[PDB]
Amino acid sequence: GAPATVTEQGEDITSKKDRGVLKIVKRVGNGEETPMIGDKVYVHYKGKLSNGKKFDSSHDRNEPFVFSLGKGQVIKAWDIGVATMKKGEICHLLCKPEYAYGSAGSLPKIPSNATLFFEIELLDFKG
């Protein structure tokens, strides 16, 4: 399924080239521009753990998730991955723990040392 596919067939988008964050573009977005640091970004997401559990989804809450890009408000994999997206893009990300919650985890749904899968839609970005 999708998590296996992005594990095996995703592109490393890290600066380190340590395969910590892999990406597949699922729906090509609009034009060429990507957001800049500090922009307000609006995303829809779904997240799965490596054991198949769907641990979170913005769609189920009927509101997007909004954060300021590149400020460390979210896991490193999201700062990295959303910065590569166009408006209207849908991508899959596979996040090793170093770019997510590491050995700490995140109570209550994310265990220690968790590799995470996400599907992310970039709805909009504004300065």
Binding site: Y45, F55, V74, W78, Y101
Partner: peptide
């Protein structure tokens, strides 16, 4: 608080 931090 995922999605924070």
């Amino acid at each position: 608080q995922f999605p924070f931090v």
